[PDB]
Amino acid sequence: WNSRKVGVLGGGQLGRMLVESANRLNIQVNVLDADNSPAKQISAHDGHVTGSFKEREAVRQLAKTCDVVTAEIEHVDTYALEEVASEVKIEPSWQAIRTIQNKFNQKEHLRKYGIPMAEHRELVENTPAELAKVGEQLGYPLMLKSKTMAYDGRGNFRVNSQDDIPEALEALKDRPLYAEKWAYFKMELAVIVVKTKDEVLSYPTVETVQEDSICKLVYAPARNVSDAINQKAQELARKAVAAFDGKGVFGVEMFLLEDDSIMLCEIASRIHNSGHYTIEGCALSQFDAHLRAILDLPIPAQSLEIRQPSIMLNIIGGAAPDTHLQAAECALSIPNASIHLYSKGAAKPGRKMGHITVTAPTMHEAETHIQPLIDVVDRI
């Protein structure tokens, strides 16, 4: 069962956690990324392919040596993937990844399936006049969005008023964009879905908190949220994921609106930051679940249940190249703190350097244990 070889496009922390799981199962993983990547570092064998998963020919080498190829990002060359689909299984599917990696197309496909979402207008002209018109239809503020290559919200620009139109466009020059109606959410939610060969399952709904457009915190499960909203959100995520072909873990972002209704923010065709808490909080982490789904191995549902309330805090670079080691050093003394350093090295501000996951029998207790670290992070 475990003699197959899994190829992973990307060798960052996501790829790494993934390799932690395969290692557990003695399943070989061949990472395609820079030599030395966080993920090649815990997997000492010769099967790895050095290069970019944006580069056609490497992806080609990866493929020809693997039984299944998967990705640890949604910005991979799905055309290069399309080429080898003859040679190797690809999961999830490259069409699904293709639709998904372009934020506008993902939304329009989803619309066919009736998924609650924020209204938007594709921007064909990229002229301040075109945008003014949208503004009139959608109102301010508006969230100007890049369709592709999007992450950490570096390709998004909040347009508060007709007057920011120029800064917005200068900000997001040379890209296809769409403008989306503003989501007045009271909380951001996320659900990790496991799409298998036969079913679509999900972990419980959690609460995500981004600072500076970057994920800073996750509370699992979501604080002050009725089991119903929880289910609803889950139920929604599963349905949105089902509109895709292929297997594996999908990260689903959502918005909790003031009336407690739910809208989809965006889907990620791969294991995702919101789910790192499953390492310590559930029987099978999303990494475990991903491997299993793409190789058709059983996935008991109770294994995706949350064992104890957990709170995950990302370690993000600050200006000083050690800060991440500062957060971690502090972490060493937080009770019930589980520390994950990414072995990326020296920090660049805003880079994801590691994460700390804290558990306790109750959320309150967990919040109490981690505050001091949260504090340290804020201050420094």
Ligand X SMILES: Nc1ncnc2c1ncn2[C@@H]1O[C@H](COP(=O)(O)OP(=O)(O)OP(=O)(O)O)[C@@H](O)[C@H]1O
List the binding residues for Mg(2+): 74, 253, 266
Q: Is 119 left (phi over 0), alpha (psi -120 to 50) or beta?
A: beta
- List the binding residues: 74, 103, 145, 152-153, 156, 180-181, 183, 188, 210, 253, 265-266
Minimal distance in Å, beta carbon 123 to its own copies?
42
What is the rounded CA–CA span in Å between residue 13 and residue 91? 19
In 3-state terms, the chain is what percent helix, strand and coil (to 5)? 35, 25, 40
What is the rounded CA–CA span in Å between residue 247 and residue 268? 13
Minimal distance in Å, beta carbon 254 to Mg ion?
10
For position 265 contacting ligand X by CB under 6 A, the verdict is yes
For position 180 contacting ligand X by CB under 6 A, the verdict is yes
| Cα dihedral across residues 89, 90, 92, 93: positive or negative | negative
Q: Which region among 143-151, 159-167, 243-251, 301-309 touches its own copies (by CB under 8 A)?
A: 301-309
CA 137 to centroid of chain Cα atoms? 31
Q: Which region among 7-15, 79-87, 179-187, 282-290 touches ligand X (by CB under 6 A)?
A: 179-187
Strand partners, 357: 312, 338
- Provide φ and ψ at 204, rounded to 5°: -70, 160
Task: Tell how strand 89-90 and strand 68-71 pair up.
Answer: parallel
Q: Which does 148 bind (CB under 5 to 8 A by kind): ligand X, Mg ion, its own copies, none?
A: none
- List the binding residues for ADP: 103, 145, 153, 156, 180-181, 183, 188, 210, 265
For its own copies, give the closer residue by CB, 20 or 91.
20
Question: Which residues, other chains included, contact 238 with Cβ-Cβ below 8 Å and sequence gap of 6+?
Answer: 191, 193, 200, 201, 202
- The token duo for 139 is 């109102």
Number of CB atoms found within 10 A of residue 51's CB = 17
What is the rounded CA–CA span in Å between residue 32 and residue 236? 33
Minimal distance in Å, beta carbon 297 to its own copies?
5
For ligand X, give the closer residue by CB, 103 or 324.
103
Minimal distance in Å, beta carbon 296 to Mg ion?
28
For ligand X, give the closer residue by CB, 81 or 215.
215
What is the rounded CA–CA span in Å between residue 316 and residue 258? 30
Minimal distance in Å, beta carbon 208 to ligand X?
7
- Provide φ and ψ at 374, rounded to 5°: -60, -50
For Mg ion, give the closer residue by CB, 130 or 266.
266
For position 253 contacting Mg ion by CB under 5 A, the verdict is yes
Task: Tell how strand 49-50 and strand 337-341 pair up.
Answer: unpaired
Q: Among 34, 42, 183, 242, which residue interacts with its own copies (rule: CB under 8 A)?
A: 42
For position 188 contacting Mg ion by CB under 5 A, the verdict is no
Q: Which of residues 315-374 bind its own copies (CB under 8 A)?
A: 322, 325, 328-329, 332-343, 354, 359
Number of CB atoms found within 10 A of residue 41's CB = 15
Minimal distance in Å, beta carbon 251 to Mg ion?
8
What is the rounded CA–CA span in Å between residue 121 and residue 350? 30
Q: Which region among 57-65, 178-186, 227-235, 241-249 touches ligand X (by CB under 6 A)?
A: 178-186
Q: Which does 210 bind (CB under 5 to 8 A by kind): Mg ion, ligand X, its own copies, none?
A: ligand X
- Provide φ and ψ at 248, rounded to 5°: 130, 180
* H helices present in 297-349, as ranges: 323-331
For position 192 contacting ligand X by CB under 6 A, the verdict is no
For position 210 contacting ligand X by CB under 6 A, the verdict is yes
Task: Tell how strand 49-50 and strand 29-33 pair up.
Answer: parallel
For position 180 contacting Mg ion by CB under 5 A, the verdict is no
| Size, binding site for Mg ion by CB under 5 A | 3
For position 13 contacting ligand X by CB under 6 A, the verdict is no
Minimal distance in Å, beta carbon 264 to Mg ion?
11
User: Where does this chain bind ligand X (CB under 6 A)?
Assistant: 118, 143, 150-153, 155-156, 180, 182-183, 188, 210, 213, 253, 265-266
